[PDB]
Design a protein around this nucleic acid. Structure first.
Ligand SMILES: [Mg+2]
Length: 49
RNA sequence: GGCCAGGUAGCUCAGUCGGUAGAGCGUCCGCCUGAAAAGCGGAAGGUCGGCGGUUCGAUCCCGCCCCUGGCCACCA
């Protein structure tokens, strides 16, 4: 429900994009991908819900 | 070229007919050891063979194609 509002999605997209722009090496980016796009990220749980 | 069964993690396989997909071993970390392994605890890792389509969304539905194993067939 609340996890599916455009406010809570944009909240997750904004946090995802923030970590992505801040990652400055390939190895930090991989951990960013895991946390903001992997099976347990906010955006992944919203597709599971 | 024919028939059957398949292609899912680094290896060996289970599984799923629309929104989470997994095990054994392999990898990494913490405690531990002088350093290890085991044990205990915790992670990473898959374009589910490919390209189109359908769909708000496809490992899963439709189309085309590719490869693997077995049994045939052919032959210097
Ligand atoms: Mg394999």
């Amino acid at each position: 429900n609340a996890m599916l509002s455009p406010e809570a999605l944009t909240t997750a997209v904004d946090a995802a994009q923030q970590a992505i722009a801040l990652a400055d090496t390939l190895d930090v980016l991989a951990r960013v991908k895991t946390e903001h796009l992997g099976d347990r990220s906010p955006l992944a749980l919203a597709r599971q819900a």
